Design a protein around this ligand. Structure first.
Ligand code: MG
Ligand code: MG
Ligand code: MG
Ligand code: MG
Ligand code: MG
Ligand code: MG
Ligand code: MG
Ligand code: MG
Ligand code: MG
Ligand code: MG
Ligand code: MG
Ligand code: MG
Ligand code: MG
Ligand code: MG
Lengths: 46, 97, 176, 189, 109, 111, 29, 41, 26
RNA sequence: GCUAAACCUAGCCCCAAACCCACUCCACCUUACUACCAGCAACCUUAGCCAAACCAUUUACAUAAAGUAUAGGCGAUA
RNA sequence: GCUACCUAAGAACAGCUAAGAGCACACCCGUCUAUGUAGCAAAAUAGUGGGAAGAUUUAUAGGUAGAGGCGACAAACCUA
RNA sequence: CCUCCGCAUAAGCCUGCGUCAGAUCACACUGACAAUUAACAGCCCAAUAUCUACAAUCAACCAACAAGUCAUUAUUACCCUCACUGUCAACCCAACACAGGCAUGCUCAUAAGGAAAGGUUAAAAAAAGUAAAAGGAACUCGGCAAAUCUUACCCC
C-alpha cells in the first residue's frame, strides 16, 4: 500500500526507546553515548 | 581557466642566510674529528629513522616496534592497517615475480 | 505604588536622563550589613524601573532614553552581590574553614571524567533513597578505551593550537 | 565580536559597523604589539610620511588593535555625507588613520619630533621621557548631581562595624523579627 | 522528529505535559484527591525594611574620590574581631545549634 | 529567588524567608484590551504565583487580589547565517488583578 | 549622523537524495 | 598538491590556433578539436 | 592558486600581445 | 559584454620536545538538563575476509646474530 | 512508532430482514476494468467490488532480534 | 455552484495567512512587536491488618456460554489550605502549500466549510461522460466493459 507513513510519532515511545535513561540502563548503550561524545554531537540521546 | 592574471609577489630568498651559509658544516666530522661521532649522528628528525633508509614498508614496520608502543590510538590503528595492506601488496602484488 | 515602576513625569520622554556613577564595590565595604540590606531594595526598584522603560521602548519602537544608566544598575548590583558574598565567605572560613558552602565531592561518573558532584539535600539517608540508588558512580572498565580517545582528542588540539602560534610568530618577524 | 574581526575606523558596535563587517564576512587578517605604547590620546604628534607630511597635529582617537592613531583634522580625503536624494549634500573632510611608526611625538619645548622612551624616575615612576634631551613629557587630558545620586559625603560614611554575625542574621536583630523554632537535620549526603 | 530543540514541558502527551513544568520551586504537596495544599511556612516571605528616611540613593555622584581596591579576605576580617582577644591577655564551635547554619548552608541569597 | 538552593522544610522548620531577593520584574503595555484592575507583568520563569502576591504586597505595597499566569512560548523559527535556529527566549506572563478598584491605566511615555 | 539603510539576509538551499532501484520489466527463455 | 600543472592554457592554444576557423563546436572546445586537428594534419 | 610563476608570466607576456592587436600603437 | 573569472590566508599535516585536564550561580541516571522520601549490580580465547591460485590443519598484527635453528596439508608460509 | 504475532487496559459496529446468518451505511480489505507510469502517489485516483456482531476493525502503552524473531508456510513479514 | 465535508478532542508539530514595516502566477517569506489567563485536563493517596461466589446486556420477564469492565472494614497517625503545568495557527506523518495516511464525540445536510473555468479557438489523437436507426454477442482468449438484472449444471 502507501509506503511512506513509517514514522507515526509518539513522544512516550520516542523517549522510552532512544532516551537517556534507556541507554544508561545497559552496558552497551553507554558506549553509544561515548561514541557520540567522542564525535561531539550537539545532542547525545533523545 | 586556472591561470592567474596579476603576476605573483617575487620571492626574495636570501642565499646568505645563517642556515645556507652554515649548510653542511660539521658534516665530515668523523674523518677529520678522529671518529668520535658519525655524520649519521648529527641529523635531527624522527627517533625511529635516525639514520636509516628503509622502504615504504620498512619505515612502517620500524615505526611500529620502536615508537608504536607510545603511539596515539587511531594513529596506531591506521598504522597496523597499512602493514596489513602493504604485506598484501609488496609480497603478493606487482609484476616481475 | 505602581508609580515606582516609572520615574517622575518631568523626564518622561526627554530622550536623555542624567544619572551616572554607579556604586563601585570598594565604596560598599565602608557600608555595613544593615544598610546594604536596604540598598538592595533601593537598587531593586531602580532596576525594575529601567526594564519597564525598555520593554515599553521596544513596544512602541522608539529607542531607549538612556541605556547608559542601565549597565550602571547591574554594576552597582553585581558589586554588592560580590561584597556580601565576600563578607559571608570571610566569616565562613573563620567559623568552619569551609570553602564551597554548597557541599559536594569529587566523583567519577560512568563517562569516566570526574565531576564535582554537588549534594542534593535529602531527608532520608542514601541507603534508603530508591532514586539515588540507581545512579552509578563508578568506572566499569569497558569504557577505558573511550577514556584514552578523549585524552587524545584533547591533546591533539593542544598540539594543533600550539602549532599555530609558532607559525604565526614566524611571519611576524619576517615582516618586521 | 567574531574571530578574525577587522577593527575599522568605525567603532566596533555600530549600525554602520554591521554594514561593513556583517557576521558572515571573512576577510583575511591584518598584520600588527609590545604594550609600551608612548602614544596617548591627544598628543601633539608630527607626521613622518604620507601626504601632508611635516605638518604637526593633535590626535583625537587612538585604536590599540590595528595600531592606529587618528590625527585630528589632518591628512584628509574628501567625502560626501548624508545627501539623502539626487543632490550633492555636503563635502566634508575626513581623515584617514595613520599607522604606528608613521608618527612621532614632537618636542614640547622645542618643536621637533623625538623618539621617546620609558624611564623610571624616582618621582614616581614610569613616564614618557625624550631620548635626545631630558625634560619629561606628561600625558594630556560642574556636574551638579541628580535626584538619584547621593553626594560626595554619603559615599564614604564608613558605617561598617566588622562583627562575625552573618548578614542574614544581622537583619533580624535590627528588624526585631523573632523566630522561635530551630532547624532540624537534613541529610545533605 | 527534532533532537536539538530543548526538552520542555509543552512537548509530550497529556501525561508528560503535567509532570515536568519549569523549575518554579514547588511549595506544598499533593495528596489523595488531587487536592493541593499550600504550606505557608515553605512560602518564601520577603524581609523588607522601611526605606523611609534613608539617605542612600541608587547612584552616587562622579565627584566622589577614587581609591584603590581592597578585597575583604578572612585575615582582614580577623584583624577587627581580635579587639576582644587583646583584652584576654567570640566563636561558634558547632553549626548544629544555630538557626542559620554556615557550612551546610541554610539561609537564602 | 532563582538559581539558589532552597532550604528544605520537614515539619517543624522555620518560616523560609528571603533576604535580598534575586529576581527583577517588568510591567508592560497590554496589547489585547485587558479589563480595568488587570495589570500585567513579565515574570522570570522560576517565580511562583503566590510569590508575586508576596512580592507586590511587600515591596510595592499594592493591593493584589488575583494573580493569573501563563508560560508564553518564544519564537524558535529564526535562523542564523549557518542555518542554525536562534531562539528568542520564552518568559512568563502574569495578570495581577488589584483590589478595591484602583483602576490603573498604562501611562504614555514619549509624548 | 549620515544616511544609510538596513540590509536583507539572503542565501539559498541545496539537498539531494536517491529513491530506489527501478522500473521492473520482462524477458524470455 | 605538489606539482599541479599550471601551463594548460599554453598547451590548449598549441592546437586551437589551427582551429580558430572550424565549423560548429569544434572551434571552441578542446575535446572536439583534437578529434579534427589530428585528422586535419 | 598554484605554485607557478613561469606560466602566469608567459600569460603576462601574452596579454600585452592582445593589447597591441586590440588597441594599437600609433 | 553578460554570465563569469582571477586572489592569499584562514587554517592544517608531519615531527621535535614536553606526560594532559575537570566547581561562576543553579540543572543533569525520573521522560538526563527535573529542589524535597523505606533496595538490583563488573571481570568470559576475538571471529572471519584473505593467502595457500578451490579448501577442511595452517596464513605475519637500536643494529648484528638472521630470515639462521626450528615449526609447517614439511606447503603456503610462520 | 510500519508490519508479523502476542500482552495490558480501552473503543466502534447506523438502519433493514430474522446465527463465525442475509441486505446494507460508517469502517476495514483490495476482485475486475480504465486512467496514471519521472504519476496527485517510490502503489494512486475513479468506478466496480468482497466482509461489515466478529477467527471483526482500530487507537494507547509493553514484550519477542538477525546463528534470530514471528508465521491460519507466501521461505512471507522484521522501517520503501 | 459545490460540499466525500465539518467544529471540537486525543495524538503530534512548536509560533507557521495577528499588527506594523519591508525587500522582492501575482501583493504562508523577512524584520520588529504582540499574544494562549483554569473552573476543564494533567500532576493523586499514612500504615500494617482484614475483606470482597451471585456478570454485562433498558436488567425485568426469558435465555445464556466464550463465564465476565467497577465494593471494604477494624485500630493507630492526620487540623497546613487552592501551587505547578497544557490552553496559539491555515498544524500532523508521506523530501512539497503532496487527490495519499489520520483515533474518538457531535452534526448527517448542514446554522459549518469551500471554489471545478488564466484568457480565447472549439483541429486531430488521448481521457471522462451522455445519447443513437435496424439487428442484439455475429466482437473477443473470454459478455471484458457497458447496459440490464437473472436460467441451469459442472470441476475444485
Ligand atoms: Mg584460498
Ligand atoms: Mg586469485
Ligand atoms: Mg454476517
Ligand atoms: Mg454479507
Ligand atoms: Mg495472519
Ligand atoms: Mg509452499
Ligand atoms: Mg484550541
Ligand atoms: Mg514520497
Ligand atoms: Mg458557508
Ligand atoms: Mg479554480
Ligand atoms: Mg486556462
Ligand atoms: Mg444501435
Ligand atoms: Mg464468437
Ligand atoms: Mg461484468
Amino acid at each position: 500500500k502507501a509506503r511512506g507513513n513509517e514514522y507515526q510519532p509518539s513522544n512516550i515511545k520516542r523517549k522510552n526507546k532512544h532516551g537517556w535513561v534507556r541507554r544508561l540502563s545497559t552496558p552497551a548503550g553507554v558506549q553509544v553515548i561515548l561514541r557520540r561524545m567522542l564525535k561531539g554531537r550537539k545532542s547525545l540521546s533523545h | 581557466i586556472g591561470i592567474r592574471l596579476t603576476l605573483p609577489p617575487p620571492k626574495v630568498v636570501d642565499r646568505w642566510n645563517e642556515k645556507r651559509a652554515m649548510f653542511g658544516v660539521y658534516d665530515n666530522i668523523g674523518i677529520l674529528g678522529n671518529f668520535e661521532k658519525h655524520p649519521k649522528e648529527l641529523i635531527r628528525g624522527p627517533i625511529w629513522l635516525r639514520g636509516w633508509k628503509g622502504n615504504e614498508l620498512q619505515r612502517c614496520i620500524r615505526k611500529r616496534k620502536m615508537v608504536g608502543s607510545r603511539m596515539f590510538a587511531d594513529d596506531l590503528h591506521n598504522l597496523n592497517k597499512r602493514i596489513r595492506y602493504l604485506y598484501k601488496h609488496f609480497n603478493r602484488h606487482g609484476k616481475f615475480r | 505604588g505602581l508609580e515606582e515602576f516609572f520615574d517622575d513625569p518631568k523626564n518622561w520622554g526627554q530622550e536623555k536622563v542624567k544619572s551616572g556613577a554607579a556604586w563601585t564595590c570598594q565604596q560598599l565595604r565602608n557600608k555595613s550589613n544593615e544598610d546594604l540590606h536596604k540598598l538592595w531594595y533601593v537598587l531593586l526598584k531602580e532596576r525594575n524601573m529601567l526594564l519597564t522603560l525598555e520593554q515599553e521602548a521596544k513596544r512602541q519602537r522608539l529607542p531607549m532614553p538612556s541605556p547608559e544608566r542601565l549597565d550602571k544598575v547591574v554594576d552597582s548590583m553585581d558589586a554588592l552581590d560580590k561584597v556580601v558574598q565576600e563578607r559571608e565567605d570571610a566569616l565562613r572560613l573563620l567559623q568552619t574553614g569551609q570553602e564551597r558552602a554548597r557541599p559536594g565531592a569529587w566523583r567519577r561518573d560512568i563517562f569516566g571524567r570526574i565531576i564535582w558532584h554537588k549534594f542534593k539535600q535529602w531527608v532520608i539517608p542514601w541507603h534508603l533513597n530508591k532514586r539515588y540508588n540507581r545512579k552509578r558512580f563508578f568506572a566499569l572498565p569497558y569504557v577505558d578505551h573511550f577514556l584514552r580517545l578523549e585524552r587524545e582528542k584533547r591533546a591533539r588540539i593542544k598540539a594543533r593550537k600550539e602549532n599555530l602560534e609558532r607559525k604565526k610568530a614566524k611571519i611576524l618577524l619576517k615582516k618586521f | 565580536l567574531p574571530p578574525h574581526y577587522r577593527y575599522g575606523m568605525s567603532p566596533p558596535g555600530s549600525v554602520a559597523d554591521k554594514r561593513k563587517n556583517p557576521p558572515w564576512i571573512r576577510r583575511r587578517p591584518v598584520v600588527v604589539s609590545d604594550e609600551d605604547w608612548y602614544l596617548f590620546c591627544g598628543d601633539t604628534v608630527e607626521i613622518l610620511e604620507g601626504k601632508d607630511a611635516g605638518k604637526q597635529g593633535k590626535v583625537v582617537q587612538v585604536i590599540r588593535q590595528r595600531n592606529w592613531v587618528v590625527v585630528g583634522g589632518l591628512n584628509t580625503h574628501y567625502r560626501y555625507i548624508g545627501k539623502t536624494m539626487d543632490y550633492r549634500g555636503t563635502m566634508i573632510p575626513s581623515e584617514a588613520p595613520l599607522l604606528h611608526r608613521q608618527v612621532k611625538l614632537v618636542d614640547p619645548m622645542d618643536r621637533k619630533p623625538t623618539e621617546i622612551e620609558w624611564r623610571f624616575t624616582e618621582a614616581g615612576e614610569r613616564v614618557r621621557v625624550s631620548t635626545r634631551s631630558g625634560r619629561i613629557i606628561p600625558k594630556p587630558e560642574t556636574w551638579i548631581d541628580g535626584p538619584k545620586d547621593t553626594s560626595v559625603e554619603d559615599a564614604l560614611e564608613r558605617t561598617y562595624v566588622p562583627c562575625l554575625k552573618t548578614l542574614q542574621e544581622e537583619v533580624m536583630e535590627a528588624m526585631g523579627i523573632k523566630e522561635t523554632r530551630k532547624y532540624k537535620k537534613v541529610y545533605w549526603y | 522528529a527534532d533532537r536539538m530543540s530543548k526538552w520542555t514541558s509543552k512537548r509530550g502527551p497529556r501525561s508528560f505535559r503535567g509532570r515536568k513544568g519549569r523549575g518554579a520551586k514547588g511549595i506544598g504537596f499533593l495528596t489523595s484527591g488531587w487536592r493541593f495544599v499550600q504550606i505557608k511556612e515553605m512560602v518564601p516571605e520577603f524581609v523588607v525594611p522601611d526605606l523611609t528616611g534613608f539617605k542612600l540613593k541608587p547612584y552616587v555622584s562622579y565627584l566622589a574620590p577614587e581609591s584603590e581596591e581592597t578585597p575583604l579576605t578572612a585575615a582582614q576580617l580577623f584583624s577587627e574581631a581580635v579587639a576582644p582577644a587583646i583584652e584576654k591577655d567570640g566563636f561558634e564551635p558547632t553549626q548544629e545549634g544555630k538557626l542559620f547554619q554556615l557550612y551546610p548552608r541554610n539561609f537564602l541569597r | 529567588a532563582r538559581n539558589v538552593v532552597y532550604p528544605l522544610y520537614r515539619l517543624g522548620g522555620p518560616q523560609l524567608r528571603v533576604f535580598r531577593t534575586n529576581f527583577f520584574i517588568q510591567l508592560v503595555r497590554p496589547g489585547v484590551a485587558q479589563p480595568e484592575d488587570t495589570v500585567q507583568f513579565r515574570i522570570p520563569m522560576e517565580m511562583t504565583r503566590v510569590d508575586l502576591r508576596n512580592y507586590l504586597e511587600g515591596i510595592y505595597n499594592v493591593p493584589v487580589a488575583a494573580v493569573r499566569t501563563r508560560v508564553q512560548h518564544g519564537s524558535n523559527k529564526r535562523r542564523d547565517h549557518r542555518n542554525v535556529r536562534i531562539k528568542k527566549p520564552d518568559y512568563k506572563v502574569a495578570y495581577v488583578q488589584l483590589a478595591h478598584g484602583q483602576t490603573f491605566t498604562f501611562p504614555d511615555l514619549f509624548p | 549622523a549620515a544616511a544609510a539603510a538596513a540590509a536583507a539576509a539572503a542565501a539559498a538551499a541545496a539537498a539531494a537524495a536517491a529513491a530506489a532501484a527501478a522500473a521492473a520489466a520482462a524477458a524470455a527463455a | 598538491l605538489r606539482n599541479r600543472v599550471t601551463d594548460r592554457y599554453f598547451r590548449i592554444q598549441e592546437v586551437l590556433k589551427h582551429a580558430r576557423h572550424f565549423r560548429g563546436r569544434k572551434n571552441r572546445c578542446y575535446r572536439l578539436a583534437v578529434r579534427t586537428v589530428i585528422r586535419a594534419f | 592558486v598554484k605554485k607557478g610563476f613561469r606560466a602566469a608570466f608567459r600569460f603576462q607576456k601574452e596579454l600585452e600581445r592582445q593589447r597591441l592587436l586590440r588597441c594599437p600603437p600609433p
